[PDB]
From TrEMBL, chain B:
Protein name stated in the entry: Gag-Pol polyprotein
Cellular location(s): Host cell membrane; Host cytoplasm; Host nucleus; Virion
Keywords: Aspartyl protease, Capsid protein, DNA integration, DNA recombination, DNA-binding, DNA-directed DNA polymerase, Endonuclease, Eukaryotic host gene expression shutoff by virus, Eukaryotic host translation shutoff by virus, Host cell membrane, Host cytoplasm, Host gene expression shutoff by virus, Host membrane, Host nucleus, Host-virus interaction, Hydrolase, Lipid-binding, Lipoprotein, Magnesium, Membrane, Metal-binding, Multifunctional enzyme, Myristate, Nuclease, Nucleotidyltransferase, Phosphoprotein, Protease, Repeat, RNA-binding, RNA-directed DNA polymerase, Transferase, Viral genome integration, Viral nucleoprotein, Viral penetration into host nucleus, Viral release from host cell, Virion, Virion maturation, Virus entry into host cell, Zinc, Zinc-finger
GO biological process: DNA integration; DNA recombination; establishment of integrated proviral latency; proteolysis; symbiont entry into host cell; symbiont-mediated suppression of host gene expression; viral genome integration into host DNA; viral penetration into host nucleus
Any GO CC annotation of this UniProt entry: viral nucleocapsid
Shown residues in whole-protein numbering: 57 to 209 of 288
Cofactor list: Mg(2+)
Superkingdom assignment: Viruses
Membrane topology: Lipid-anchor
Lineage: Viruses, Riboviria, Pararnavirae, Artverviricota, Revtraviricetes
Species, as recorded: Human immunodeficiency virus type 1
Segments forming domain Integrase catalytic: 1-144
Annotated catalysed reactions: 3'-end directed exonucleolytic cleavage of viral RNA-DNA hybrid; Endohydrolysis of RNA in RNA/DNA hybrids. Three different cleavage modes: 1. sequence-specific internal cleavage of RNA. Human immunodeficiency virus type 1 and Moloney murine leukemia virus enzymes prefer to cleave the RNA strand one nucleotide away from the RNA-DNA junction. 2. RNA 5'-end directed cleavage 13-19 nucleotides from the RNA end. 3. DNA 3'-end directed cleavage 15-20 nucleotides away from the primer terminus
Molecular function per GO: aspartic-type endopeptidase activity; DNA binding; DNA-directed DNA polymerase activity; endonuclease activity; exoribonuclease H activity; lipid binding; RNA stem-loop binding; RNA-directed DNA polymerase activity
Amino acid sequence: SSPGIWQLDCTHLEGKVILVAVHVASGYIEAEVIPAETGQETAYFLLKLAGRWPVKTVHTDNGSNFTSTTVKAACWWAGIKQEDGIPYNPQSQGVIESMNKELKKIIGQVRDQAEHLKTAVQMAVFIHNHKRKGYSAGERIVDIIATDIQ
Amino acid sequence: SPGIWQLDCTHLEGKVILVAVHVASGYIEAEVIPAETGQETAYFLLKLAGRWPVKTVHTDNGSNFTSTTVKAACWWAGIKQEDGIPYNPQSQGVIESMNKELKKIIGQVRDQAEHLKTAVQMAVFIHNHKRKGYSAGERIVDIIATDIQ
Ligand SMILES: O=C(O)CC[C@H]1COc2c(ccc(/C=C3/C(=N/O)Cc4ccccc43)c2C(=O)O)O1
Ligand SMILES: O=C(O)CC[C@H]1COc2c(ccc(/C=C3/C(=N/O)Cc4ccccc43)c2C(=O)O)O1
Ligand SMILES: [Cl-]
């Protein structure tokens, strides 16, 4: 059920890890900088996400997070169906790849305005979600979910 | 009114919980911080505005209203920074009641989480999903979707 489907994505910059959740149907994202991708960090990130949006299903970004007892506990707690992230549809890889490149580009364009990477990442989230493509990802996610509620 | 948020700072376990409330829906986001500085508040607002269409923020106190860092974040994110003076006196009691409710939920989950920040995010989840019959999460999406359309 596509209003509730999210995909996890982990990318790297400046020796740090950027964890991204993408609302598949809209392209809307949330993201955080973490020192390393652990089960505990991923679990906490998912808890935050699911408190903020109606997360029904998460396609996990790798097998370690899929396997993680802590991630499984968070998904249980928050009522999330934890699934694999195998791109049975091969265009999924390229879409995530393209978004990571886009995000890193935006981070570069703002990096000087922020002392810390985490600030630049949140600026990138803002720019990404507001970008008009003509609706924005932020507009699309609200519309999709509102239509589902109705 | 679809774009109006209110900041709220409350305390528990010698730590600070910073809350943003979407006034029309009662929907919240929250974080635990060591202390409420301009820098922490600024970063919190940047996060919020990247996630929801934040037009106006009623700041929680005069220090954050005055803060150059908070003003910079509001400028960056296109947020109108306003005071949080309750010209409508029922605003105080509503925020008061929510802080009490949140602390209650935190108590009900505190044992399930080692760290306060986890308990706070559990509380955010429970608050936003609670049916009152629609939930705050349902109301915010409906309000904003109607505004877009
Ligand atoms: O560094 C960061 O940002 C996050 C680091 C840690 C913060 O603390 C935690 C964390 C990750 C997990 C936990 C534990 C959970 C449970 N244990 O049963 C049940 C549960 C249900 C849902 C979510 C988390 C937990 C904790 C915690 O124990 O509080 O992420
Ligand atoms: O501890 C935590 O979680 C948050 C602490 C810090 C994280 O870093 C920061 C922070 C708060 C502020 C900044 C600086 C900003 C600017 N300077 O011009 C312009 C700007 C525009 C918008 C938002 C932040 C900033 C930084 C930073 O410089 O990166 O919050
Ligand atoms: Cl304080």
